[PDB]
Design a protein around this nucleic acid. Structure first.
Ligand SMILES: [Mg+2]
Ligand SMILES: [Mg+2]
Ligand SMILES: [Mg+2]
Ligand SMILES: [Mg+2]
Ligand SMILES: [Mg+2]
Ligand SMILES: [Mg+2]
Ligand SMILES: [Mg+2]
Ligand SMILES: [Mg+2]
Ligand SMILES: [Mg+2]
Ligand SMILES: [Mg+2]
Ligand SMILES: [Mg+2]
Ligand SMILES: [Mg+2]
Ligand SMILES: [Mg+2]
Ligand SMILES: [Mg+2]
Lengths: 102, 144, 203, 210
RNA sequence: CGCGACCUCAGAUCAGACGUGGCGACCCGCUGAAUUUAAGCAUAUUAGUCAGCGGAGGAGAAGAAACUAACCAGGAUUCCCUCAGUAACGGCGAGUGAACAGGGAAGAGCCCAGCGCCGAAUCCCCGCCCCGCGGCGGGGCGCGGGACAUGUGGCGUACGGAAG
RNA sequence: GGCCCCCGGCGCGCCGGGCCCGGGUCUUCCCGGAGUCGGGUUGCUUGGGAAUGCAGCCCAAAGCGGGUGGUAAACUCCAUCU
């Protein structure tokens, strides 16, 4: 025939019909719920911020974003975790900026 | 330097107000073991002859316990929350003033977890919450 | 739902409120003895997460351990041998300090069973842990299924055989490619299997 | 010392091996003890199959063994759900279940539901109280038809679809098997770099005129 | 300005229980050499072994995936055969050295915390009565004590669960 | 093969009491373990090799997150577990 199943190539593999199904409930782990988000927001305004988080906000306030990321990565430890933390710290700065605007 | 989350529990109710609050709260104490037995036996006697189920309007009662009160505040079901000022592991109630204010339920801080315990026939209670109240005490609860 | 708030609160150990509480408590624990019974769990949510229940038979012991590594206990630093074994300082104990605190609680209270432990504070020179113990002969413990397992003879001194959560972490147990050292139950179990010469009857 | 030609040998006998030597003089005794336990277990579960629960049809993982099929740990919940068996009742009637096994394809799914439906048809169920047969089975098909089953229940067997000889068409004769394999390997190897070069060329194309 | 509640502590030859020490072939947690080999020797090897300390049971430990894989996918632990003296480590020297898949022995799965709902529904102790003794339980009673809302019990646990 | 004595677990009728509703469909809700993970460094350990595991010290999390995917790193998709 023109084309055959192959053990190599971009479309390699034995051909089976894929069984589509709902993902397992363990794969749901880590999703943020409405109540858990509410609790974490409660604790954040009760507690505040860690001293390194406040320092990183000063760097973001003067728009030293590369230096802020270097500082956060040195504190938290990894690039992926630092990028997520920097976005959140940028978000709270923007949130309190528009709160003080009105 | 005590952070305001911990310093807020030093502001307790004055003696006059705490007296009106506990005097009202005396009318809604949870039923003891003895009078629950008396009530349950009466239900058994009445069910035997001859009314039947007879819910008979489960009366308003003072809800107690930090886990119970927290859910009531989160559901906006509490009308008034009373927090003891001397919870020794002070993490059980540090969020409650902020949580109550966020949910709009009025809250006060009172002197003595032992006084709250006597309300519920126990040694100690962190918090008690006022749910719906009898009509003759709606005026009193509103003033508080 | 208050336990959820306390859990999120204790995840903020560097906040102003938690920094104050941890410092004051660490000062207070410094004034007490190294081994000391606590009237109640300091962290009730963390305790019950680890197996504790507020009923008779469960007791709490606060343990204070000294921080740092393990100096080799040789006279004048002389470890007579090859230079690879000359190390005296910068040596580290195989078991964590939490496992040591559990062992000290269990040794003192030999009639109780160590269940778990958790962190309540630390200094530059001390770490403080609270250990959950169970009285195996109290009727509340003994008449309850789902708790009767701790009453068995095989479960005595778990903290000394590395069977508690803290003591288990140093044994290198686990599933998959990172934990090939302990296939068979332990390092010794794996080592004996891999170093035994199987001489069959028919070779 | 080496002596003339020979193989460079590396014995692993430098580690006090004689303290850990496993002799096998209890091998014949071990086989007797295992046989006795098997026979005692079979007697204990008197009409139930001696080998145990039915096992699913399962393909072997890697590329070395994926042509073979064997018995798995237990039936997946997706298989039981479409076969109409409760996941908690299945273990009572001799069906092994594996809650952590997934079904990636439908062929393996449907292969195992015919296995469950075949087993369920061949199952003789005794009533809990023999004097009160509620919904299990008739007494006729369990008075004498009940017999302990020896060997695995419905043993998993590799099957081959025999192809009859056919006339080779011209399209099959013109197919280039070696050339296709060589080109398929090249296409998979250069797929990522071909896209990047096309992407870079597209960037130059959308601004080439200015 | 004494009397109460709680908290945190203390004493008792208080009522009732429990631990200690031995054995230690097998098992678990640590600590841990040097002889030796390298034709010297220091890394390496001996060896995570001897010695040392602690803790168990009739077995122990492990154990129901923060797994293996990359397949058309398998599916807790433990043991045997094989993988394999292999991948790898190594003054890349002497030497050391697993795992996956496959075939078997055996095969068994579950429980909390948390989120919630249920008038704390929960548990221990002490007196009284009856049925029993043989490892001390069953039932009933006590406006009898205590624990416990700083959280007991029932439902329920990632395979989803609850309520209509 | 016989006789004697003792002990233990198997079905039936009864006894004393407990014992409380299961599945499918739809709808509305609810879902998780923190000085822990992870990172740096140090020492030991491993076949684990730009670091397999364990531990001390310092830093110190997130929630479409986290871990793993045997070469360090950035971006991207996927797989797998929790
Ligand atoms: Mg050496
Ligand atoms: Mg006495
Ligand atoms: Mg002993
Ligand atoms: Mg030599
Ligand atoms: Mg020599
Ligand atoms: Mg020894
Ligand atoms: Mg065991
Ligand atoms: Mg275990
Ligand atoms: Mg699981
Ligand atoms: Mg070979
Ligand atoms: Mg070695
Ligand atoms: Mg078998
Ligand atoms: Mg509960
Ligand atoms: Mg790579």
């Amino acid at each position: 025939a023109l084309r055959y199943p192959m053990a190599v190539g971009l479309n390699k593999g034995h051909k089976v019909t894929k069984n589509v199904s709902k993902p397992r409930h363990s794969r749901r782990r880590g999703r943020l719920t409405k109540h858990t988000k509410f609790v974490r927001d409660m604790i954040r305004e009760v507690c505040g911020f860690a001293p390194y988080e406040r320092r990183a906000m000063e760097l973001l306030k003067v728009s030293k974003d590369k230096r802020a990321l270097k500082f956060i990565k040195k504190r938290v430890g990894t690039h992926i975790r630092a990028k997520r933390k920097r976005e959140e710290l940028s978000n709270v700065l923007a949130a309190m900026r528009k709160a003080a605007a009105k | 330097k005590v952070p305001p989350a911990i310093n807020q529990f030093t502001q307790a109710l004055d003696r006059q107000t705490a007296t009106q609050l506990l005097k009202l709260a005396h009318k809604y104490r949870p039923e003891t073991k003895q009078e629950k037995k008396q009530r349950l036996l009466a239900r058994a006697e009445k069910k035997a002859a001859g009314k039947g189920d007879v819910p008979t309007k489960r009366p308003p009662v003072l809800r107690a316990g930090v886990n119970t009160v927290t859910t009531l505040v989160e559901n906006k079901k509490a009308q008034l929350v009373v927090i003891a000022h001397d919870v020794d592991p002070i993490e059980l109630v540090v969020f409650l003033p902020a949580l109550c204010r966020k949910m709009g339920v009025p809250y006060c801080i009172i002197k003595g977890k032992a006084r709250l315990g006597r309300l519920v026939h126990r040694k100690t209670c962190t918090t008690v919450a006022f749910t719906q109240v009898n009509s003759e005490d709606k005026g009193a609860l509103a003033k508080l | 739902g208050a336990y959820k708030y306390i859990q999120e609160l204790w995840r903020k150990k560097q906040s102003d409120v938690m920094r104050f509480l941890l410092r004051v408590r660490c000062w207070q624990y410094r004034q007490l003895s190294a081994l000391h019974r606590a009237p109640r769990p300091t962290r009730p949510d963390k305790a019950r997460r680890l197996g504790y229940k507020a009923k008779q038979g469960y007791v709490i012991y606060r343990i204070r351990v000294r921080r740092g590594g393990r100096k080799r206990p040789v006279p004048k630093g002389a470890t007579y041998g090859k230079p690879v074994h000359h190390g005296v300082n910068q040596l580290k104990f195989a078991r964590s300090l939490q496992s040591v605190a559990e062992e000290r609680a269990g040794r003192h209270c030999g009639a109780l069973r160590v269940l778990n432990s958790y962190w309540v504070g630390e200094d530059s020179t001390y770490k403080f842990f609270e250990v959950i113990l169970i009285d195996p002969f109290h009727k509340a413990i003994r008449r309850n299924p789902d708790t009767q397992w701790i009453t068995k003879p095989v479960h005595k001194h778990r903290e000394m055989r590395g069977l508690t959560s803290a003591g288990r972490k140093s044994r290198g147990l686990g599933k998959g490619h990172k934990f090939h050292h302990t296939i068979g139950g332990s390092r010794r179990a794996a080592w004996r299997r891999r170093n035994t010469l199987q001489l069959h009857r028919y070779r | 010392a080496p002596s003339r030609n020979g193989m460079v040998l590396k014995p692993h006998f430098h580690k006090d091996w004689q303290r850990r030597v496993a002799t096998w003089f209890n091998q014949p005794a071990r086989k007797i003890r295992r046989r006795k336990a098997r026979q005692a277990k079979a007697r204990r579960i008197a009409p139930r199959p001696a080998s145990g629960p039915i096992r699913p049809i399962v393909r072997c993982p890697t590329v070395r063994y994926h042509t073979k099929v064997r018995a798995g740990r237990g039936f997946s919940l997706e298989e039981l759900r479409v076969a109409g068996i409760h996941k908690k009742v299945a273990r009572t009637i001799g069906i092994s279940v594996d809650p952590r096994r997934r079904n990636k394809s439908t062929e393996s799914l449907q292969a195992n539901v015919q296995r469950l439906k075949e087993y369920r048809s061949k199952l003789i169920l005794f009533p809990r109280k023999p004097s009160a047969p509620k919904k299990g089975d008739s007494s006729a098909e369990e008075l004498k038809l009940a017999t302990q089953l020896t060997g695995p229940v419905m043993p998993v067997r590799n099957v081959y679809k025999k192809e009859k000889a056919r006339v080779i068409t011209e399209e099959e004769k013109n197919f280039k098997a070696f050339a296709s394999l060589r080109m398929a390997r090249a296409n998979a190897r250069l797929f990522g770099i071909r896209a990047k070069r096309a992407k870079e060329a597209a960037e130059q194309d959308v601004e080439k005129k200015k």
